[PDB]
Amino acid sequence: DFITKNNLWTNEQRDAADKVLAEIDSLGLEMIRLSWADQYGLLRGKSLTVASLKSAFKEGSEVAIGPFFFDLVSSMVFNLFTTAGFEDELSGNPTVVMVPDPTTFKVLPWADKTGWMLADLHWKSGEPFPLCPRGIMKKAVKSLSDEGYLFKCGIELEWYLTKIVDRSLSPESLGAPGVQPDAIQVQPVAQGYSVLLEHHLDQVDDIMSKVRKGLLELNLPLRSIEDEWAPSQMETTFDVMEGLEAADAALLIKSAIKQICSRHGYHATFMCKPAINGFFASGWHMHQSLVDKDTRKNLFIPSEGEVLSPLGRAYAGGLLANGSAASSFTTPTVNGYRRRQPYSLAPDRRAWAKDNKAAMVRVVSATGDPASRIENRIGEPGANPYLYMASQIVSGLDGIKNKKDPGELQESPYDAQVPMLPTTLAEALDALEHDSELFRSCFGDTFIKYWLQLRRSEWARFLDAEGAEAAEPTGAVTQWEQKEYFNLL
Amino acid sequence: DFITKNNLWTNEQRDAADKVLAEIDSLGLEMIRLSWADQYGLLRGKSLTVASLKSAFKEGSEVAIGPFFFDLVSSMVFNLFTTAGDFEDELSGNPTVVMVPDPTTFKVLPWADKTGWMLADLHWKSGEPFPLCPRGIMKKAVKSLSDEGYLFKCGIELEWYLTKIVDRSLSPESLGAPGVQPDAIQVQPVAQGYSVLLEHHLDQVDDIMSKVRKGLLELNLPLRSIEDEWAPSQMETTFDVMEGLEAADAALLIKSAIKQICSRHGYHATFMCKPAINGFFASGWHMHQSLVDKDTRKNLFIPSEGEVLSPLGRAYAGGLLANGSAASSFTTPTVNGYRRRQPYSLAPDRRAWAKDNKAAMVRVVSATGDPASRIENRIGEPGANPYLYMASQIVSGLDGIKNKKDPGELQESPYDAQVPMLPTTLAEALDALEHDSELFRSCFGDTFIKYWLQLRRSEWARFLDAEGAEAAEPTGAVTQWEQKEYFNLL
Ligand SMILES: Nc1ncnc2c1ncn2[C@@H]1O[C@H](COP(=O)(O)OP(=O)(O)O)[C@@H](O)[C@H]1O
Ligand SMILES: Nc1ncnc2c1ncn2[C@@H]1O[C@H](COP(=O)(O)OP(=O)(O)O)[C@@H](O)[C@H]1O
Ligand SMILES: C[S@](=O)(CC[C@H](N)C(=O)O)=NP(=O)(O)O
Ligand SMILES: C[S@](=O)(CC[C@H](N)C(=O)O)=NP(=O)(O)O
Ligand SMILES: [Mg+2]
Ligand SMILES: [Mg+2]
Ligand SMILES: [Mn+2]
Ligand SMILES: [Mn+2]
Ligand SMILES: [Mn+2]
Ligand SMILES: [Mn+2]
Incomplete structure (x- = not known):
């Protein structure tokens, strides 16, 4: 038991783990995604079966740090083949352990019998991995708590909603390591430069109502959906959240918007x-x-x-x-x-x-x-x-x-x-x-x-x-x- | 509590708020739109969740006055980046106003998914009314008329065009820019004309006009008649007598509902x-x-x-x-x-x-x-x-x-x-x-x-x-x- 041995879970976390396993059995979920934000904020990880997740609730799930040493197109910026003597050389592909955080568990409403949870990256020694962005957020939150304060954040996100014309999946458009693949081809969904026009909200609501429902079913404190200034530019705001929960929420919000839109042939x-x-x-x-x-x-x-x-x-x-x-x-x-x-x-x-x-x-x-x-x-x-x-x-x-x-x-x-x-x-x-x-x-x-x-x-x-x-x-x-x-x- | 502090709701309005929240909960609505007419009469605002609306019934909902300082294609006519020492004298900046919901105007929009709708009055954060709000100007007129001892009674008789959308002009090259007109929607007429008031024309267009009719009737707007006007695809909708601010509100909703239903079914009103x-x-x-x-x-x-x-x-x-x-x-x-x-x-x-x-x-x-x-x-x-x-x-x-x-x-x-x-x-x-x-x-x-x-x-x-x-x-x-x-x- 890697988790207990290194005392990585609070009592709150362990009880949450028990109730998460209960929800998984009750709903008949078949997969649980275990993810973590990379340096760019993009969710990386694995999808596990029920049995593998219960095993990961004890041993974690081994993963490679490759993503941290790649840019968005997988240019090798830090050599990955030499085992280092790490924090001084930044080389190699050492294995880290995804340690699931049970308090972040979510059922993904747009997917087939799939749950979702974030993980913290730890050396196999048990010490936190120093490049983990979530760990940096945790350190900031703890320093603020040491000064006697809590961070309250209102998430106000602008983004673009487009309709997919071509997903750019032809072999010649796939690029290579260090070579950008072709951008998805899209079409705008509405004219703009008529800010906050209600008719714009109604025009795009056949899809935006699905985005809204997905966010509401994820229990995210959605506050408003709005037509932004530009054509097909949208805004979604959320009620106040606190610290680490707020950062996790922003990550899930962006992921959910993109996945729902893609599931219905749109690109957010x-x-x-x-x-x-x-x-x-x-x-x-x-x-x-x-x-x-x-x-x-x-x-x-x-x-x-x-x-x-x-x-x-x-x-x-x-x-x-x-x-x-x-x-x-x-x-x-x-x-x-x-x-x-x-x-x-x-x-x-x-x-x-x-x-x-x-x-x-x-x-x-x-x-x-x-x-x-x-x-x-x-x-x-x-x-x-x-x-x-x-x-x-x-x-x-x-x-x-x-x-x-x-x-x-x-x-x-x-x-x-x-x-x-x-x-x-x-x-x-x-x-x-x-x-x-x-x-x-x-x-x-x-x-x-x-x-x-x-x-x-x-x-x-x-x-x-x-x-x-x-x-x-x-x-x-x-x-x-x-x-x-x-x-x- | 912005609303109570500045005595912005009458007792009728507070009672209406209680019933509005009750109807929202009973019908299981998920969004409630808070909208207001800009200088052009176009509905502007936000769609709020139930929790955010419940908060807005106490604190209001902040918005920027940007629309008032934009023209229809968003040419910036008034500097929005220099905050004015005296707003009414300089007319500059992008100060925040509070949308104060009017619960007596609540409607369930029948053509949308689990969505309610309400008008809001724009008020300064000080609590005073925003001096450019069209609804406020109407409220002022209704008050001056009431002081003389009279009520304004208005029968809305609007003429408009019903066309079928051919192209929504959404290609990037057609989207315009700030201060630059986007392409018009391409459309097709739905019926010949110059045969005024022909019943056969009413029947010909009624596959969609019946939907407009049902939408207006479900909103409890007092529809009186639908008629074939002189020109090809020209329609007329008239309404029974309404009074003052309610009549203006109704006209606004009438136009909004017609346009949205038509667009929902591939037509442009x-x-x-x-x-x-x-x-x-x-x-x-x-x-x-x-x-x-x-x-x-x-x-x-x-x-x-x-x-x-x-x-x-x-x-x-x-x-x-x-x-x-x-x-x-x-x-x-x-x-x-x-x-x-x-x-x-x-x-x-x-x-x-x-x-x-x-x-x-x-x-x-x-x-x-x-x-x-x-x-x-x-x-x-x-x-x-x-x-x-x-x-x-x-x-x-x-x-x-x-x-x-x-x-x-x-x-x-x-x-x-x-x-x-x-x-x-x-x-x-x-x-x-x-x-x-x-x-x-x-x-x-x-x-x-x-x-x-x-x-x-x-x-x-x-x-x-x-x-x-x-x-x-x-x-x-x-x-x-x-x-x-x-x-x-x-
Ligand atoms: N005390 C507070 N601390 C932090 N954020 C808050 C607080 N009160 C409200 N908010 C947030 O402010 C945001 C307002 O968003 P929005 O209405 O788009 O503002 P604007 O458009 O004026 O920038 C919301 O995300 C809301 O959660
Ligand atoms: N006392 C009144 N005050 C104001 N409007 C009225 C009154 N009585 C009837 N009306 C309105 O007059 C209108 C008649 O419309 P319509 O018959 O199409 O006019 P027209 O004679 O120009 O064709 C309706 O909107 C109706 O509500
Ligand atoms: C109306 S805007 O100022 C538009 C901001 C612009 N899209 C930008 O920040 O680049 N956003 P908001 O009013 O919500 O604060
Ligand atoms: C038949 S008409 O006289 C023609 C009205 C015309 N469309 C106009 O431009 O005012 N209008 P109405 O019947 O409502 O009186
Ligand atoms: Mg905003
Ligand atoms: Mg007439
Ligand atoms: Mn903002
Ligand atoms: Mn914005
Ligand atoms: Mn007339
Ligand atoms: Mn006429």
């Missing part, structure tokens, strides 16, 4: 800005408040003369001060930097403002209002949820602990004289490299080295394919971006 | 006045209106033996006529609607009233002692914003009542009357409003009028740059700009 994409005429950039704005661990009261609520409590003001200051170093985490994709431009309802600057969607940090609050909170509009829909939320926790807590000041609330953020944000992924990586202390301390030195190496390899690929001129945010979306992100994100 | 399709003649929205007593609920327009209307109704008509040019942009808000401002079209080109003559702006339908006695204002277009159209009527008529204005002589031949001509272009309607702005600045609000003038002139400049002055003349052919501006959404 969280690629920031697809290379399709008429498609405007999508954003992932992170609504966030801190509550007291004990009182469970929103500690961002302002007084009469304030936009935020002094605690929320310092949290905003930390968000702004670290927004450049954290850019590669909030906006991991090269195509996410298409949003780094003015007059776009997306931030190009490290500025905060009250109820102004031109700013990076938008304060939504009223005196005494427990909904008072920060909206960070820097994120992209394809961000790894664990890294996005952990970067937010780390930045805000750095602001609180070092009592950093956000400065003046900016009326007219796009004319503000504040430090500019990175305009390319390379700039974001540069910003992290030269200001790495906070994230090396909180995310881990080994992880930051691995991250820098991998993301720079991807940037070199993009630059080799398209050239430097293309990186310009206002430029047209390149085919490299489409063939890197459209299918999988 | 359009309230664009005159589509750029060969053979399609202009559609009209004639507003039938009477005033009743707030207490006796008896028609105060009913004439005596030697009169076509009571003195109140004759003074109400005078107010309509005197202010008909200033109100033109409200009754006839689209460029395309001014294709009706021509002299032998059963549509008005002049500020004249007449008894039972459909050539005049104001047609009096009455008989001595007949509670059906009323005024028909034939100036409106089907694509009008119901709130602004009905409110313009209330405002003009009450102005006529208070100034005891004389409608003048009933015109036997309204198209030969030597009376002021009505504006022939949207630009002219805006000029007329600007030069005669007192009444509508006072009753609709000064900020709303400044905003309206700026927005509509920006749209007119777009049309003029795209088609030229030669095109504006009413009898000219309908331009591609008009089709691509109005066909899909109106």
Whole structure:
């Protein structure tokens, strides 16, 4: 019993495991997917039979770390054939153990008799695997809990709904290791640039009603479905969730949207800005408040003369001060930097403002209002949820602990004289490299080295394919971006 | 609790909220839409889950005012990125407002999956009403009329086009851009025409029209008649008398339901006045209106033996006529609607009233002692914003009542009357409003009028740059700009 021997499950987790096995027998489920987010936030793993899952509830399930050493097209960035003497060399294909987390169990409503659960990656020694994004989120959550606070997050996701025309499965379109396969061919499902039009919601509801039902059956706190600005651009928002549960929920939300749509011949994409005429950039704005661990009261609520409590003001200051170093985490994709431009309802600057969607940090609050909170509009829909939320926790807590000041609330953020944000992924990586202390301390030195190496390899690929001129945010979306992100994100 | 704090719900509304939640639970609904009319009369908003709606019955639901600062194709007319120090003076920024649900408007949408529907009033986070909300302008008109002791009674008679969709124009090359018109939906007529009121036409189109009929009846809208209008595929739907804000709400829902049901079955219903399709003649929205007593609920327009209307109704008509040019942009808000401002079209080109003559702006339908006695204002277009159209009527008529204005002589031949001509272009309607702005600045609000003038002139400049002055003349052919501006959404 690997799990008990290394005391990897709390009592809550073990009892949850008992009730999960009961639900599996009662429903007659036949498969249970055991998955974990990779560096890109994509779910990787295996589907197990009932017997194999009950065995994994004791021994775990051995898996290889290959995904971490691959980019999205399986370029070998770190050599996988040499057993290392690991955290210093980042080489080899060592085996890790998927340790199931029973509290995350779900029945997938769109699949045949299939359940679903996340796993934490552990060395066979029993120590956590240092590249696991979920582990990084757990570390951030624990540091926040050590400071006496809980992270409350409202998930607000923009994405694109399209109808599949060709799945690009012909042999000649499959690429190779390090060679992008062809993008799926699609057709928009509705005109746009008539924001929040009810008729648009009705027009697409033959499929969106299935997405809605799937989310509701997964017991996710769906809050709203909305027609976004662009043609076929949708928005789904969720009620407030807390910490690790919130990150897991975002992961499942994106997975479920994509799988339901594909099951009915649609392609949902969280690629920031697809290379399709008429498609405007999508954003992932992170609504966030801190509550007291004990009182469970929103500690961002302002007084009469304030936009935020002094605690929320310092949290905003930390968000702004670290927004450049954290850019590669909030906006991991090269195509996410298409949003780094003015007059776009997306931030190009490290500025905060009250109820102004031109700013990076938008304060939504009223005196005494427990909904008072920060909206960070820097994120992209394809961000790894664990890294996005952990970067937010780390930045805000750095602001609180070092009592950093956000400065003046900016009326007219796009004319503000504040430090500019990175305009390319390379700039974001540069910003992290030269200001790495906070994230090396909180995310881990080994992880930051691995991250820098991998993301720079991807940037070199993009630059080799398209050239430097293309990186310009206002430029047209390149085919490299489409063939890197459209299918999988 | 935003709603209770600012005393935004009456007791009737709170009771309705309780029953709305009970019906939602009993029917097992999963989504409830919260919608509101924008400046154009188009429903904007969100679809909420049950839990989120239950929260919105206490705190409301935040939204941005973006729609008000966009035109139909999302040209940014007002800077949305500089927050204003004084919003009503600068009209800039993207401030947040609160959708406050109105539980008395709740409906189950019969054509959708487990979906309810409700209107919301936009309120500042301070708790004050949002000054550009069309429903608020109507609420203000209903209040001013009630203060004088009268109730607005309106019979909705909308004309519209029913076509079958051939191509939804969803190819990426057809989607447009911010401020750039997308391609019009391609359609096909459903029946020949120029055989007015033919029963066989009604039967021919009834495979879908029966669905529209059932949808309207299940929404408890007081449908009165379905009729074959003159042109090929031109329909008419009329409704029994409704009152004030409820009448405006009903018109809005009526148009929304017609369009959604038709689209659900592969048809396109359009309230664009005159589509750029060969053979399609202009559609009209004639507003039938009477005033009743707030207490006796008896028609105060009913004439005596030697009169076509009571003195109140004759003074109400005078107010309509005197202010008909200033109100033109409200009754006839689209460029395309001014294709009706021509002299032998059963549509008005002049500020004249007449008894039972459909050539005049104001047609009096009455008989001595007949509670059906009323005024028909034939100036409106089907694509009008119901709130602004009905409110313009209330405002003009009450102005006529208070100034005891004389409608003048009933015109036997309204198209030969030597009376002021009505504006022939949207630009002219805006000029007329600007030069005669007192009444509508006072009753609709000064900020709303400044905003309206700026927005509509920006749209007119777009049309003029795209088609030229030669095109504006009413009898000219309908331009591609008009089709691509109005066909899909109106
Ligand atoms: N105290 C809070 N802390 C964090 N998020 C919150 C809080 N209260 C509400 N939210 C969240 O804020 C989000 C609002 O989404 P949305 O209505 O799209 O905002 P906007 O469109 O103005 O950015 C929801 O995800 C909701 O869960
Ligand atoms: N007292 C009244 N006040 C306002 N409208 C009325 C009154 N009595 C009847 N109506 C309305 O008059 C309209 C008649 O429509 P219709 O017969 O199509 O008009 P038309 O005579 O122009 O063809 C209906 O909408 C009906 O509700
Ligand atoms: C209306 S928008 O500002 C659109 C944002 C844009 N798609 C972007 O962030 O790139 N999102 P929201 O109003 O929900 O906060
Ligand atoms: C037969 S008609 O006179 C023609 C109306 C025309 N479509 C118009 O443009 O106003 N309308 P209605 O019967 O409702 O009075
Ligand atoms: Mg939003
Ligand atoms: Mg009629
Ligand atoms: Mn949005
Ligand atoms: Mn947002
Ligand atoms: Mn007619
Ligand atoms: Mn009529």
